Amino acid sequence: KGSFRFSYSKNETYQLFLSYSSKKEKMFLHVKGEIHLGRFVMRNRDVVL
Amino acid sequence: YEDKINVGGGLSGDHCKKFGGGKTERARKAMAVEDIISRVRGGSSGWSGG
């Protein structure tokens, strides 16, 4: 009389997680003003110094 | 099997796999540029300019 018994059990659990994020913001607001008063025209020729 | 000589034998295997995959990607971009310029030749230095 002889009895042979054998068993086996195995589990290999893997897990992976990956994330990525990026945010950007840019602003270039500007303003300008010109308050004019008067204009003149200098004579080109026949002028005194 | 046995015959009255006995021969013994027995086997039982079990295998199992569980795989998983998931990916997610989201992008959101918004750009707005607004410029308003008004040229007025009304004839007011300071008050007309304002």
Ligand SMILES: *[C@@H]1O[C@H](CO)[C@@H](O)[C@H](O)[C@H]1NC(C)=O
């Ligand atoms: C193996 O062990 C891991 C860790 O506890 C478990 O998450 C997994 O479910 C096990 N395998 C089985 C088939 O249950």
